[model samples]
Target chain A: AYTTFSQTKNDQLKEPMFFGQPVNVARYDQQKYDIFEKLIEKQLSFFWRPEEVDVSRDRIDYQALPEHEKHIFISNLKYQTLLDSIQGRSPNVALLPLISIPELETWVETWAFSETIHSRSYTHIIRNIVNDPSVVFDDIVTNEQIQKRAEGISSYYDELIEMTSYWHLLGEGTHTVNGKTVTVSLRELKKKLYLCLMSVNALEAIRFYVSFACSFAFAERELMEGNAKIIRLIARDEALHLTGTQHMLNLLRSGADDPEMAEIAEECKQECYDLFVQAAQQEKDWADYLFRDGSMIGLNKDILCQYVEYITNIRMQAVGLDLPFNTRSNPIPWINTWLV
Target chain B: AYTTFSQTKNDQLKEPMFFGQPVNVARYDQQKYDIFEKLIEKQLSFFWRPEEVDVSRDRIDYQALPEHEKHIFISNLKYQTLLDSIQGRSPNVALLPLISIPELETWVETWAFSETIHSRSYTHIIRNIVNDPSVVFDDIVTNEQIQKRAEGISSYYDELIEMTSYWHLLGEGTHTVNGKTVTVSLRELKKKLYLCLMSVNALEAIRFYVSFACSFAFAERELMEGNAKIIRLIARDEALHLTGTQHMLNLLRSGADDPEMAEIAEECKQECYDLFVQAAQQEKDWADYLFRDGSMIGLNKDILCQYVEYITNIRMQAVGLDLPFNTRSNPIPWINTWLV
Candidate 1:
């Protein structure tokens, strides 16, 4: 039933964003929602190679850095690398099986592909600055702080993928599996997908920005400008990536695409809020680890945590969730200049 | 146990292409096979927007085409559209979860992403040439000939996806579902994956080239030159795509990546050869349909059939399969001028 190419020649515009007829023909003459198409276009237009930016000078800057600052820089990269690694493959694995429209289908691929480029950028940056890049790539999996973040961010995706496999294999029904009753509920799957989107939206909106702040902080002091240049391009793409998920969240809540998803959004309102708060808290905890030894000149743990709270509130509100924290201005206003 | 971010911290260079540890960190520092990385780079370099090519004159050129030439052109466009549509999502949906290495994982993504661009190019071409693009998109499913091609091409992908779902959900063992036992075997999944790659390689190598012949034939007459420009770009990408799959198949057969896959490749040798022969025959049958109305100059049913056999042989031999047809020169030598 879950064919990669659905043979049904259905009206793509009338289909829900997920859990409808699978997209048979990837036509873009029109869309049920045009934003996915625009996101796909803008993402393609922002196409770039990691090698386009030279990071050779970062080697000197990195060598001269104090041990604590080196830890901050390298550890931040490991965290970023782990996050992109999850993102690069998860959306396609978890969501494509359920997508029902061409615009959104292509958008998911474009979104995932851009993340790969970011992943590649890490290699380009790491290779230029570090003599042993494998040492950095190797530590990403073993580091407890990074693995905690990895598990947190990937929990939703992993659960979705696991449940998706069940839904795809046994479909929606109760069945006897090894002397046990296995219930594959469509409503439950849809709820998981809605929450996964919420989780991913937070990843793009909150987690990514915090890392970008650190990268820009390095460039602010006229160091590692090469890494800053690449991160700038990545942030530009992430802006579109977050906007896509934000729109998806809002549209699902509007019930314009799937009436069930709107219901799920309402049902999980508290859970979604808690999800954002947990992610923001994770970012704060991550800041603690990042600046444990010492904070850089322009950035510190307290200020970075403030930025997290501020961004979480704004991103949550955009997706129709209640703010989880008190509203405040951006702690580092200079970060604004780097985002666009 | 299958997480998007594997925290096991193993050497990625030691992993197989499929069913190994999930890629935890998407690093491009090194690869077990360098060809995939090169493919990714070339694909990124070859990126182009379909809208960049002006197709305004195609509307008039299409209007002036004789009824049969018009039939040949639009129908070819529809078939091409359907193929790209399947390709745009299939590789990611069926391959990403199974891939173990970083380069091949990202290569699968980059491959699928390029297909999306080809699909978009179809809408761009169809929108400029046709009055109601829906008519073209709609007929793709209802047309028996088109559906036959669609089902033939997608069946392998569908089977692999279904098998993958079972493997992912239940792992490799016997399972009970509603008092019925189902066996999800790793060996079986590997064979299915190999067959799926063979199916896809033929798709990129033979099926796509046959269609390209028709496209270049029109451009030979200086008609629909804009469409030719887009198809040329598509051909370039498809060449890289086939090369990616070809390398995957060869590497598997070499038993260097996964020893079990090499054994499976030999076990399925006869079946794969028959698969290509069937695909080649289908293309010939498709040729009959395309020319049923009448053939255009420099292209007809017989010439296209010869081209199909010619390509089927060359593609089969490259993939370690026996030649499916007698060796012969390419019938459509003019296609070479347009392919690069």
Candidate 2:
């Protein structure tokens, strides 16, 4: 039954979240949690490749746009790419190791895999819009406003991973090396995981939704219809990922999945609240930056910032938080026509 | 170029790897490593769905088989199910958090995503082969022989994941709780990671190839050709996975990927050796159990065990392990014809 270079004893259907018998046979004949199965089905049914879509028409649309509209379109594209780049890698690397359940683990990978396709789709879109797609991609990293936020997002994961690696190797023990003392604890590890998830929640709920509004704003004028169509697909998938993050938050808070995690969740609540609130505020700031050059016909700094607060309220509520801001009205109500 | 969530600053993509400034813009138009990019491309190009292939004819082929052949077929399938079940979940859960590169992160997800499809295919194959698919799935957990092995394999991952959760939650520290002390350290974590990879390598390299031989043996006799065709596809994908793990191990051992990992690899070399041998021995035991019922034409426990040893030696050498068993030529060279 145990073959070295041996097969996985993967009975995914029967395994529990963290420590079940090693999955021996990798069978989907059944599953302990059908959610992963459902997600896999949905993701596969939604299977697409970047090459499947044609974006040739976006070139003419992009080149002919007024300078202000061009700024809106290109800057938003940079933001979208930056967001996806982190998402595509983070789930598999940072979160996958701690997943106890087989279905949830697979779901994490499936979700991340789909994001890569979204990343490729951006390249497809950009190559069509600009003669040198590199200019657009390079600008995403160099852009002053977007570059500011990547650290907070990446650092939590980096630290969490580093810590997890040690815990896995050493168990719990103190050691001195290179004339320094080091210690590790299980509680601290859980905190990192909790906070990291909180950060990821903010990224998905607040960050992605903000970028989506800009995308749909352009679609409101029916320009960049192809790009918008691709995004609609991305949005549908994001709905599932957003749901996944929400469920994880709920499970940790409820203490049903792992009772100890409940305490961790409780300890981190204020931290979580601050992170979400802070992220919402940053998006509002970004809204101003996007519009400083010149406001687009339908989306301006004032209206975009309002929508940020509006979306933040809904996102906060999903994670068991109260309204973080008071911008209640849908500043860009018409954008919903394109989004929904 | 880093900013806290609430900070209003511009982030930039100014570096690479661990020390590189945290990726500011997540722009892929530029990348620090091309390997990840290559993996992303190869992975996308390799995508396939389980539904695309019809295994309907296997139902007829299965029903007509003698009891021994039926035993042979279903047992092998169950074993394969175990392998896929682990793969579908593990990569994202295990590898995602530590990945510093964007392309590698995406590749991890892509690889795991493909495994889910393989898991799905098993369900499809079993449903076609058995009168009641539920019975087959139920046995995966309850069957004494299968369940026992499933536990051994899963425990390694469970142990790694438990520490990982703690490590992620807390960095390294010592705390006494309930009169027990816990410590976490990076070196310990690195060791666990190396062992985990060794375990996984054995699964992919040795265990899977054993199953492939059994699958192809049927095709050699011109029986159950449909089942063989499906196995061929599985083999093709496994080759990629096999290659991926090899690269990871070689990179770690050769000090090519993460330099810090080199010492960890060196320290764990013996553990890896022991683990590989342990798995190979277990497979030999399993081979005896399989043939106890009686041998089928062109296949039996003795021949299968020989093939196992032969393939084990080949895989062990590839990963820099000295041959642990005597080298033997393929007992069933005809099987390769079907595999190709």
Candidate 3:
């Protein structure tokens, strides 16, 4: 899956997906595929350090909010922090070595690097709006709703990575450990990877969009514009990230990269579909928890749940899965306009 | 080595090095270690977009040089393109997955992202000075000297990565593959990692210095100030990179991160020393090729070779290696002035 720090000896532009002699040179003089190149250029052009944004106004807005609204906002921020925290470092740590192309490699780094800036943006926002930024952050680890969502999201990546480690560190075999031969097979590793991708799709497609509705719902009231601006930028980057994940999933499903991966994709289709639907249900549950105290001005538990179902249907269709959610209309239609 | 993305159930401050779990949230609200946080801050503060620097002046300066000098400059540029081309993607591609700590993970991404900017700077520079950029970039592979250097540099990282792939895909054990029972040891993989660090140290510490000397040598006579300024920024970055490698090697050697790594450091001492020596010798050979024609004023084969040895010792000593060269008195003192 990995080779020299530089895979320049071969024409990288012509290499296949997944397995190759590692990339040597970082030259863009030529590329076999320009999608990553375009991604890099677009990402670079879109570059704006978090320091470029201002969040000073969020502090005043926070003080004026009612108690339940304050709870909603703070809890949502906590969830966002948890989401970006995972995203800031996971792609490179999880996916880089398995990547077979130069541009994709760079794209992975770019994507991860951008998330760090978003991570910083949260610190900036939280520091400005809260008296005890430490408490806000410290509570993220203890919050029940955030903690539950975190488990659902992290378990998939962990399962894949642990299996990958076992597969790499211990060869596939029926080995006697603790007086038992536990058969570690490549097929199991492949399945874990497939499920991991499905889990990731659910997280990105369902979980993240649910969080975005909360953030955008605030912006709809014309409050926390500075925070919303940053969210918009973050959303734009996420769009690119989704494109990357979609490409990765499609490549495996089509078996264009590796036949083994394609086989894994085929075997896991229903399970993958189920992951999306289950995630949608979890989001609806989260929506109920968010409004347990009371509803905000334009948003409530029922509407947010409807949005979850609505978005899940679209995301499932995007990846060729049968739509499972029945919501036919936008729960918060105005939230859609600023998304693009 | 991945457990789950986010163990919302557990405090992130406490996690295993690698194969613990996939990170779920992209949060920087806190860190288990501060070293990576500092590196991220420093690296982010050092951010620069390549387009911001103007190399338009280099077109005329390059055109004014005599044929051989022009060859030296262009060839050096080509080699640099090759080095960064590899570096821009390798660290992210090869090392990211193995990193367990969040700060370290981001640092790897930030470091590689910066390298992409450097790679882009080369294109900007080449686009300014040359008629056909493709001709120069394409020749990077075919050129014997550059290719030889590329091979030495890449081999260490390549082997480490290959071992990593095996280690990640299969745990340490003797496994029969295609009728061959191959034994993979984690200690062995760890050693490959240490040596790979040494190889990277050599590249950043020695090879980059040689290239800088060439770029600064031009500015020493006041020829390419525009290009010199860009290289100066690059020099500043390399200082940080060299510092980072030193920290990694020191940390490993001291048994701070992993004790087995310390043993690997001890075993790889001579190999590390040899790498520095070989790199210096290669630079000397390259110098011979560079100045074979009528030499440039204040710079020639012997002096550059002496400079190489002088630097080889300083850098070697920094990473706990004994001095490999007695030529500690800097051969080109004026060059040291520019670096300062």
Best by DockQ: 1
TM-score ranking, high to low: 1, 3, 2
Name the regions of candidate 1 deviating beyond 4 angstroms.
none
TM-score of each: 0.98, 0.76, 0.83
Q: What is the lDDT of candidate 2?
A: 0.71
lDDT of each: 0.89, 0.71, 0.74
Model 1 steric clash pairs: none
Chain A: TM-score in each model: 0.98, 0.91, 0.91
Model 2: how far residue B325 lies from native, Å:
6.7
Give one digit per residue, the lDDT tens place, for model 3 in A183-264. 6787776677667766776777777777888988888887888889988888787777776777778867886666888887
> Considering every candidate listed, which one attains the maximal lDDT?
1
Ten contiguous residues with the weakest lDDT in model 1 chain B: B146-155
| lDDT tens digits by residue: candidate 2, B1-340 | 1111212223233222322232333334545556656766766676777666777777888788877778877888887887677777666665554455555556667777877777778887887777787678667656677655444566676566656555554556765433456787766877777788788888888888888887877777677766777788888777777777777787677776567777777877788888888887777777665666677777887887788788888888898888878878888888677554
